[PDB]
Amino acid sequence: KYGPLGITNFITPYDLCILILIHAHCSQDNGISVPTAVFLRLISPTRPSLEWNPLLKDNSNLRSSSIVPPPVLPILDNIIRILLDDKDGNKIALTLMGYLEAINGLDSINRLMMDLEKNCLVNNYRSMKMRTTSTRRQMTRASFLGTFLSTCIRKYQIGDFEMRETIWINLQNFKTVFKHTPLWLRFKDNVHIQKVKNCLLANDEISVEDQQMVEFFQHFNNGNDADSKTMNEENYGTLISIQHLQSIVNRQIVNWLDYEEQSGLVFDLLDTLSLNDATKFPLIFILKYLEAIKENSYQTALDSLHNYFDYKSTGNSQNYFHISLLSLATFHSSFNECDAAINSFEEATRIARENKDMETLNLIMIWIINFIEVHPEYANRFYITVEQIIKYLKNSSDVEDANIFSNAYKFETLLSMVKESKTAEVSSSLLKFMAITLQNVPSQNFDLFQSLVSYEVKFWKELGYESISDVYEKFLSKTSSSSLRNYDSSIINQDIKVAFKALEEDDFLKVKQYLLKSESLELDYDQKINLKYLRVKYLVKIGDYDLSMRLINQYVKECCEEVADSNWRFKFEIESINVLLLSDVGIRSLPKIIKLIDEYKEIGNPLRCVILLLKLCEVLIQVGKSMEAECLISCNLSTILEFPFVRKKTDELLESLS
Amino acid sequence: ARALRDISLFNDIRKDQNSVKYIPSLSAYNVFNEFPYYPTSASQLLDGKLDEFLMLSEQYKSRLPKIRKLGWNRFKPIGINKTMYELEMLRSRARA
Amino acid sequence: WLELMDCLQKVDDALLLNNYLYQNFQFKFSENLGSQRTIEFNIMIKFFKLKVFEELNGQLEDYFEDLEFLLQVFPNFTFLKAYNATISYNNLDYVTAESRFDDIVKQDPYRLNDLETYSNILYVMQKNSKLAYLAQFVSQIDRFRPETCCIIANYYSARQEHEKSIMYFRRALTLDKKTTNAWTLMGHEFVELSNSHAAIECYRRAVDICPRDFKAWFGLGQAYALLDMHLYSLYYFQKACTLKPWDRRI
Amino acid sequence: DCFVVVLSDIAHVYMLKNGGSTTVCFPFQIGNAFWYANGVILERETSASKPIEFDLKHKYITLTDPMAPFGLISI
């Protein structure tokens, strides 16, 4: 089914296949009505235009609410397998089989075009009811098939005789390809083919004289191979329109990003383009660009990325230079270059001002904090602080925003969570973001919906309620990840959770080998801290504490200056408490623990107070004053069982007191 | 693209609180006449991208009457000093 | 020979074939006349030396003593002088090449084979009256050669008539698609039209025909440099650096 | 902290720790390349075809960083 691929502005052999089916359905002489599902799979890919930006937008509208079958490749083998599935589909498939055998010439092709335009197609419904004398079904221009057939008819009167000669040469080439297939052998004889074929071949006006040499003109042109064939220019094996090719690739990249498809067939045909279709169809370059990221190729990806932005910018009359730089900046952020992306992005702001268009700045401003969210350590380098943006976007407008406010409030929530603000304000801010996301469609905006789940699981896990976290955890999508943050980030993140499980299960050999991978991999900041935190916990288990104690405080010191992450400042703090008291010297931690107790009492996070409570009771039991620790734990025993992951530490202390 | 107003909730609250130049592309330039093609309407500009089929369809529609419109104006037969453009002009006045 | 020269891609390939032509290659002395089958006294091997070694701009060897030997045997051969003039052209020696070309036109007035460089010399030389003379004279022979459609466009470019000059470059390429040098010129002719979008594709096709085009990279780099996208043009300038590192301008 | 790959006559210098990518040319073809502290030693291609001829006066090139001009060894 493979062959050279070429873009054609004329009647592809695929287009006539739909034309064959619509003729049978409208003729109503055979009583054969094509199922509505068959038409919706064939014509719909041909419908014009879907559009797809490289990045900055993921499946904003491309996602179909109802799952759709993949578009069908232009091979007679693939089209039949659609009709063939039905028990009576052999009747429908044979109808197409007979017609494709009936059309042995270009004049016959013209017969089909003339029949549809004069009788079948109808200008408007007002003449439909006055055409009750028609023995065939009639179609309106504005209908689904009507607008399709009008374009096909327009696409037929547009070319010269050179256009029609190429029509018939390829179809016979297209037809004879299916002849050398196993499926054709199963349909070698079907008696119904002769019946349907003879229905249209009648009224030939000659059967004695012209048909002897009518055969001669075709056979001589065809490759009988008795002698050397008549020499002709190389002809493409498959012809596809721009719109049909757009639907296959868009489905392929979406399917690759996250009824069976043919990845092998689509990729081979797309590799045989004549280098002029790629200019008329720039999206072929990016199809390599997504593939290039998969194997993590640096030089290959950049040439494809640059190539896609040279062809797209000129075709679109609007200025798109202000979009190319940030996307390249996005690509730079994907390979953890970070600093190189900053210089590239900076020049994007200057070009946007020259255009003097307001709508693009919001796209620029949204990209700002998305990059800072992945890499919070660069918040100082920007010319605008993160708090400035939130104040601008909150009062941005009252109309024509839709998703801007949904974006605006989530960034405030991350900063408030990092700033260890009061839990009353964090819940209210998160409420603002949850209400605006779910108000509109959450399915189309898959990216923010996943980010809601990630925050809410993180927010409630921080509160200490795993029961709530578990419900939302089943909705967080895996391996989906997000744009501008690598491509193997999902694999690494899944690996971190395995390592944490291995520490609990005392698989010290596994974690030790993984820590070797940590020091020479390029990791996102959120991934850095976890492995940075993982290294601290592993060293505590081993028993060596001089290195870990000198190591943990440098982390927290740079966890307060480089990034003002309070949550990770707290989480790092308690291991040092655990390191001290495990070494039979926890009194040094008494000044440190109390500063956090009254500090977190004002905040009101119950998980924070109780964890400090366990460390306080544990301090008091290693000094020789376990009497009052029992009294203190007894009054608060009711409120400390509400948190599941501390019960194991809580229950274990109970047998010690006994 | 709900514009914050297609949301029923925030739309309800607002009521209570109240109380493009074109540049040619490379494919646009043609071989025969150095004048580039200028699209007639914004419908032929697909998201800023010029549809090669649609533009070439208009080109065929333009050239088609041009063959029939050949004889108008300049062409003059021998033996008749008046061209057929005003043959139909006086013919129009004949019945009217 | 031309089909054989075409399949060569790099200079190191030429050295491999040249050695093969010397040690383990010999002609059928029966078919060829005597005193000719000898490789040292052949002519095509000599003409091969002048051809492949300079169009690919490869390292020269056994090239000097052959060149003067062909000038002695062929003093009136039109092809050699145009090639000899082209050698002056390739070394950025424009004044001497002009004197060399002036003999071709006077001796052979109808030769639309290497005049593309002649009208290329005249454009850099300036002197619009002479170009207007050449453009009128060359177009009179025939307008179907690849060259005859590039000479006129140059004449039309000097007169600041861009919407017409842009037309001939597309015309000059259609007759023979091998003349990729007209792609960069067609791109330049968009820049003067204050149409940066159309220029980008014209330059970009040139590198896609053959990536080893210093002219195409430089012309594409400038079109971004004219706009504010300074860093976005840095990669293109970097690529052009590898083609001709030994240049002050780049 | 840069990863360098040397072709027959072209070198690509990709910055990994920080920065972008750079590329440099060379006066002639390179046989092999050997790393030394703060630079690379390049050996000319000796012979190819089958005649065997080679140069001996100078075939080694020392470069410290991509932008600076090359240097010559001393023996």
Side-chain angles (χ1 to χ4, degrees), chain A residues 2-11 13-50 52-187 189-194 196-202 206-208 210-214 216-232 234-258 260-276 278-397 399 402-438 440-545 547-589 591-641 643-658, chain B residues 1-14 16-17 19-20 22-57 59-96, chain C residues 1-27 29-36 38-250, chain D residues 1-16 18-49 51-75:
Chain A
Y2 85 101
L5 187 61
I7 198 68
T8 308
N9 293 287
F10 310 132
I11 304 84
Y14 207 78
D15 189 74
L16 61 83
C17 296
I18 294 91
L19 288 181
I20 292 169
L21 294 180
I22 193 167
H23 197 320
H25 179 87
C26 68
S27 292
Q28 79 98 34
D29 284 331
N30 291 337
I32 292 167
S33 59
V34 163
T36 56
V38 172
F39 282 147
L40 288 180
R41 185 164 183 177
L42 282 296
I43 297 89
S44 60
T46 61
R47 310 218 66 259
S49 185
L50 183 63
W52 185 79
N53 270 336
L55 296 81
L56 288 68
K57 54 190 290 183
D58 191 324
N59 66 19
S60 287
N61 62 339
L62 277 79
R63 296 286 187 172
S64 285
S65 307
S66 176
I67 302 301
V68 304
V72 190
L73 267 73
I75 296 91
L76 163 66
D77 170 277
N78 290 25
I79 62 173
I80 295 297
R81 174 141 311 171
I82 302 299
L83 295 174
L84 185 62
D85 282 0
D86 291 331
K87 63 183 183 295
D88 291 331
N90 303 0
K91 307 191 177 184
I92 197 64
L94 259 53
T95 299
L96 188 153
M97 293 297 100
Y99 263 50
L100 183 67
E101 198 68 28
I103 299 301
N104 47 0
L106 301 83
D107 189 358
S108 77
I109 291 175
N110 202 1
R111 295 194 188 286
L112 309 189
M113 183 279 288
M114 206 66 38
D115 201 349
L116 297 181
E117 190 276 358
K118 64 90 172 182
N119 197 3
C120 296
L121 178 144
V122 161
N123 183 16
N124 205 346
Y125 175 71
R126 298 299 152 182
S127 60
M128 186 66 204
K129 269 192 172 181
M130 183 278 288
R131 282 319 289 270
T132 53
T133 53
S134 306
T135 189
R136 308 145 185 97
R137 291 183 192 170
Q138 285 172 185
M139 287 73 74
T140 61
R141 303 271 303 306
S143 294
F144 176 85
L145 279 296
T147 183
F148 174 76
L149 188 153
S150 78
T151 298
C152 300
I153 288 296
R154 189 31 181 271
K155 180 266 285 187
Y156 187 67
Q157 294 179 356
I158 191 166
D160 63 358
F161 185 81
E162 182 69 24
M163 183 278 288
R164 293 174 202 175
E165 62 84 22
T166 51
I167 295 299
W168 186 65
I169 180 63
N170 315 310
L171 61 83
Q172 304 283 336
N173 204 345
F174 156 83
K175 156 72 158 292
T176 190
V177 159
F178 181 70
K179 281 180 184 316
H180 310 163
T181 60
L183 176 58
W184 181 222
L185 307 172
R186 185 266 297 292
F187 286 88
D189 54 336
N190 302 129
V191 69
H192 190 39
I193 299 169
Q194 317 317 301
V196 65
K197 173 163 67 173
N198 293 344
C199 289
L200 272 300
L201 307 178
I206 178 63
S207 163
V208 55
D210 295 331
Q211 87 294 341
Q212 72 253 12
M213 61 86 74
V214 163
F216 156 80
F217 280 151
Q218 291 69 241
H219 277 195
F220 198 92
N221 190 4
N222 305 143
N224 305 151
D225 200 3
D227 57 347
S228 299
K229 282 170 58 181
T230 186
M231 267 65 58
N232 46 5
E234 184 69 22
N235 45 5
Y236 299 173
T238 57
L239 297 98
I240 297 89
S241 67
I242 311 101
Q243 293 103 16
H244 185 260
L245 184 57
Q246 165 151 166
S247 66
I248 62 170
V249 298
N250 276 290
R251 200 64 202 276
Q252 186 76 349
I253 73 160
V254 164
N255 264 6
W256 183 257
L257 190 146
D258 59 357
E260 61 181 1
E261 67 86 20
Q262 296 294 321
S263 72
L265 288 175
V266 170
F267 268 90
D268 312 318
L269 282 296
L270 282 186
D271 292 332
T272 81
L273 188 158
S274 64
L275 293 173
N276 57 331
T279 300
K280 293 191 292 295
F281 178 71
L283 277 72
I284 192 66
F285 273 91
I286 192 168
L287 189 152
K288 286 167 61 177
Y289 161 70
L290 275 296
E291 190 276 331
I293 286 181
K294 179 171 39 176
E295 58 266 357
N296 189 358
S297 300
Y298 191 16
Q299 176 51 39
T300 310
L302 200 50
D303 59 67
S304 179
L305 180 61
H306 270 156
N307 281 3
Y308 173 57
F309 287 159
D310 297 318
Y311 294 66
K312 179 170 175 66
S313 175
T314 187
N316 205 310
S317 295
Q318 300 178 3
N319 187 356
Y320 283 7
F321 293 156
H322 62 87
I323 301 187
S324 86
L325 282 72
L326 61 78
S327 64
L328 187 151
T330 295
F331 159 69
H332 272 286
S333 46
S334 50
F335 280 13
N336 299 113
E337 289 179 359
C338 294
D339 51 48
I342 295 293
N343 298 53
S344 67
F345 170 81
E346 185 271 345
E347 211 191 320
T349 61
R350 290 192 287 115
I351 192 66
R353 303 208 299 293
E354 314 288 32
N355 265 353
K356 287 181 185 60
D357 46 351
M358 295 293 102
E359 73 295 339
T360 188
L361 276 297
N362 290 348
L363 259 53
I364 302 169
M365 289 299 102
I366 190 61
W367 189 89
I368 298 298
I369 298 90
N370 288 318
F371 177 77
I372 194 66
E373 184 276 331
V374 66
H375 310 132
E377 57 189 0
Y378 285 120
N380 69 339
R381 192 47 37 67
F382 278 58
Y383 72 109
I384 290 181
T385 71
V386 297
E387 191 55 17
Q388 283 160 324
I389 298 303
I390 320 290
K391 182 67 174 67
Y392 185 82
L393 282 296
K394 280 184 57 176
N395 189 4
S396 67
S397 178
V399 66
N403 198 47
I404 314 301
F405 306 122
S406 57
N407 276 316
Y409 290 131
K410 74 170 289 293
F411 295 105
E412 186 295 348
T413 61
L414 62 77
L415 61 85
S416 287
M417 183 278 285
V418 175
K419 175 173 309 310
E420 181 197 14
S421 172
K422 285 287 284 187
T423 62
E425 296 73 331
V426 174
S427 72
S428 53
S429 176
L430 188 148
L431 201 173
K432 299 160 182 168
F433 176 69
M434 62 79 69
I436 193 66
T437 63
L438 276 299
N440 60 52
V441 65
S443 82
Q444 286 181 353
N445 290 3
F446 180 77
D447 70 9
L448 271 43
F449 183 79
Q450 284 304 314
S451 197
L452 179 62
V453 171
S454 180
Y455 278 136
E456 216 180 7
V457 66
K458 183 167 72 172
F459 160 77
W460 283 100
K461 153 73 93 173
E462 190 283 330
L463 273 294
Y465 294 163
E466 277 80 357
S467 65
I468 207 164
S469 87
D470 185 74
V471 70
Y472 288 122
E473 181 276 334
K474 73 192 306 169
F475 281 102
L476 62 78
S477 181
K478 69 194 64 63
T479 301
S480 176
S481 74
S482 173
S483 198
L484 69 90
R485 45 166 300 124
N486 212 312
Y487 176 72
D488 305 336
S489 66
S490 65
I491 198 174
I492 300 297
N493 280 9
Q494 212 60 38
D495 289 350
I496 304 311
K497 315 300 307 198
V498 159
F500 274 106
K501 286 283 305 310
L503 276 296
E504 302 276 339
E505 298 314 338
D506 291 331
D507 197 331
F508 297 93
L509 259 183
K510 210 195 279 294
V511 64
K512 186 165 192 168
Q513 296 284 16
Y514 194 108
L515 183 63
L516 264 294
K517 289 242 182 181
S518 46
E519 60 208 299
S520 181
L521 277 156
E522 303 71 354
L523 283 296
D524 170 29
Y525 173 85
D526 184 358
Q527 304 158 353
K528 214 73 61 173
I529 298 295
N530 274 1
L531 61 78
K532 187 180 285 186
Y533 171 68
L534 183 57
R535 185 191 325 254
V536 174
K537 280 224 297 189
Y538 162 71
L539 279 293
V540 173
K541 259 53 173 184
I542 295 286
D544 47 348
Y545 308 137
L547 73 159
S548 68
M549 180 60 204
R550 64 191 81 216
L551 190 50
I552 185 167
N553 70 6
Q554 64 85 29
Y555 290 162
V556 62
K557 190 201 72 69
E558 83 183 9
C559 185
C560 190
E561 298 325 281
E562 196 197 25
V563 175
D565 195 312
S566 303
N567 265 6
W568 277 125
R569 188 168 64 203
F570 171 77
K571 292 188 234 178
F572 285 161
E573 275 318 317
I574 312 300
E575 301 53 31
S576 71
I577 297 171
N578 271 322
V579 171
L580 299 194
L581 187 158
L582 194 152
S583 64
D584 291 330
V585 178
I587 301 299
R588 313 278 213 282
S589 179
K592 183 67 180 296
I593 58 167
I594 62 173
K595 277 164 284 281
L596 282 296
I597 285 173
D598 64 354
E599 198 265 5
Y600 272 99
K601 290 293 288 296
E602 66 183 0
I603 298 288
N605 188 359
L607 183 62
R608 302 277 190 261
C609 61
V610 65
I611 193 66
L612 297 179
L613 180 63
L614 277 296
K615 304 301 180 291
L616 185 72
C617 55
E618 195 85 352
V619 169
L620 183 62
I621 64 168
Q622 78 158 206
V623 302
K625 320 174 83 174
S626 88
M627 195 36 48
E628 192 76 0
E630 191 275 334
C631 183
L632 189 144
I633 196 68
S634 167
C635 66
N636 275 216
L637 61 77
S638 66
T639 185
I640 68 171
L641 271 295
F643 306 147
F645 92 98
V646 73
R647 76 181 288 99
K648 185 269 178 182
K649 205 61 181 295
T650 300
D651 64 358
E652 190 268 335
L653 276 296
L654 284 192
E655 69 274 12
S656 72
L657 61 83
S658 73
Chain B
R2 316 295 295 283
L4 156 70
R5 274 213 202 243
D6 204 38
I7 305 298
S8 288
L9 178 57
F10 289 66
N11 185 2
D12 268 356
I13 314 313
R14 183 68 140 156
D16 297 332
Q17 295 296 109
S19 66
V20 65
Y22 168 79
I23 296 92
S25 304
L26 73 164
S27 180
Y29 284 178
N30 189 3
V31 60
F32 262 88
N33 61 314
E34 51 76 21
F35 288 98
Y37 182 76
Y38 274 110
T40 62
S41 72
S43 50
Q44 317 67 17
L45 61 78
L46 188 68
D47 301 331
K49 284 182 31 53
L50 294 174
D51 189 357
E52 69 275 22
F53 163 66
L54 183 62
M55 63 79 71
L56 172 142
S57 168
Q59 284 210 270
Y60 172 109
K61 204 39 71 174
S62 66
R63 66 181 177 88
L64 183 63
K66 275 301 308 303
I67 292 89
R68 76 181 67 250
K69 205 200 167 180
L70 189 153
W72 270 251
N73 296 115
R74 181 176 319 208
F75 293 95
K76 182 65 69 177
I78 61 179
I80 306 294
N81 54 0
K82 64 169 295 316
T83 199
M84 56 70 82
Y85 183 36
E86 66 274 15
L87 202 174
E88 178 86 29
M89 289 298 102
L90 56 88
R91 194 36 60 71
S92 159
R93 185 177 65 247
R95 64 143 301 287
Chain C
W1 289 98
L2 271 295
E3 206 61 275
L4 188 152
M5 61 79 71
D6 189 357
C7 70
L8 282 296
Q9 315 192 11
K10 294 162 161 113
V11 54
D12 57 358
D13 296 329
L15 62 85
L16 187 147
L17 61 78
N18 192 5
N19 294 323
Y20 191 99
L21 183 65
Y22 268 129
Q23 285 85 19
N24 49 4
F25 190 66
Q26 74 285 359
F27 298 166
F29 187 77
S30 58
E31 209 292 320
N32 283 259
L33 276 296
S35 175
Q36 182 57 253
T38 61
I39 50 174
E40 192 276 332
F41 280 114
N42 205 4
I43 292 185
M44 298 302 81
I45 302 163
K46 310 293 191 186
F47 272 101
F48 185 74
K49 179 61 59 56
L50 61 89
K51 184 58 62 173
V52 65
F53 264 90
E54 297 307 319
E55 293 180 353
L56 182 43
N57 210 135
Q59 171 181 347
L60 73 165
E61 61 92 20
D62 289 328
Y63 174 73
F64 281 163
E65 68 273 26
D66 291 1
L67 194 152
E68 282 101 10
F69 164 61
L70 276 296
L71 267 296
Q72 157 189 322
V73 61
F74 288 163
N76 303 335
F77 192 30
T78 75
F79 172 79
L80 293 179
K81 303 179 195 26
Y83 167 71
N84 179 287
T86 296
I87 288 294
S88 178
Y89 202 114
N90 199 37
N91 291 4
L92 280 298
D93 293 329
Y94 281 97
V95 166
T96 73
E98 182 274 343
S99 73
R100 306 276 194 78
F101 286 108
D102 283 332
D103 186 74
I104 303 296
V105 164
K106 186 72 44 163
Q107 176 175 355
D108 192 313
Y110 306 115
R111 176 180 182 82
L112 300 169
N113 293 110
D114 293 330
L115 283 187
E116 51 282 17
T117 66
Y118 194 103
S119 64
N120 192 359
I121 289 289
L122 293 194
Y123 184 51
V124 175
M125 185 179 288
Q126 325 295 128
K127 154 195 71 177
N128 291 322
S129 89
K130 179 72 66 65
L131 277 296
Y133 170 63
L134 195 153
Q136 185 61 70
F137 167 60
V138 298
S139 175
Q140 183 66 41
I141 298 89
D142 63 328
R143 307 193 174 90
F144 300 143
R145 294 290 72 75
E147 312 315 346
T148 187
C149 291
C150 69
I151 297 89
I152 55 172
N154 271 353
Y155 155 72
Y156 263 88
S157 177
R159 188 177 277 78
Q160 289 83 21
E161 181 62 25
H162 296 74
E163 293 83 4
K164 183 76 71 68
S165 50
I166 189 63
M167 185 156 157
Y168 282 157
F169 285 165
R170 172 191 258 264
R171 155 64 39 167
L173 60 84
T174 301
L175 282 296
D176 189 358
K177 267 80 72 168
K178 187 65 64 67
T179 304
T180 182
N181 286 319
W183 269 127
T184 76
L185 278 69
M186 179 142 80
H188 286 100
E189 183 66 25
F190 284 108
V191 175
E192 290 293 328
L193 186 58
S194 78
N195 186 357
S196 75
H197 287 264
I200 298 298
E201 281 292 317
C202 187
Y203 292 102
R204 183 71 180 86
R205 283 178 201 280
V207 176
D208 285 331
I209 301 299
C210 185
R212 174 187 320 310
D213 291 331
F214 175 85
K215 185 64 140 163
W217 280 118
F218 186 76
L220 188 42
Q222 291 261 356
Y224 281 158
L226 271 297
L227 297 171
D228 291 331
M229 288 73 72
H230 285 80
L231 183 62
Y232 189 40
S233 72
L234 183 63
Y235 163 73
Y236 293 0
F237 285 131
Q238 287 176 358
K239 191 69 68 173
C241 179
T242 71
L243 275 297
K244 179 182 201 310
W246 31 267
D247 202 304
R248 173 202 81 260
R249 192 62 159 289
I250 178 162
Chain D
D1 202 350
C2 182
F3 165 55
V4 177
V5 61
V6 179
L7 299 177
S8 81
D9 70 328
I10 294 300
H12 294 56
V13 175
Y14 301 94
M15 301 292 103
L16 290 177
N18 185 297
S21 64
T22 64
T23 308
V24 295
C25 308
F26 301 81
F28 39 71
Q29 298 84 320
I30 303 149
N32 286 330
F34 291 165
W35 293 272
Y36 82 97
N38 82 11
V40 189
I41 302 300
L42 284 72
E43 293 179 355
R44 211 163 178 278
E45 175 57 44
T46 60
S47 300
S49 302
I52 303 169
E53 291 85 1
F54 61 91
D55 189 7
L56 274 172
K57 63 95 176 179
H58 281 118
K59 71 176 74 63
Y60 297 115
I61 295 296
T62 180
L63 76 164
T64 77
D65 48 350
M67 72 295 291
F70 308 115
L72 187 72
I73 72 169
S74 287
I75 189 167

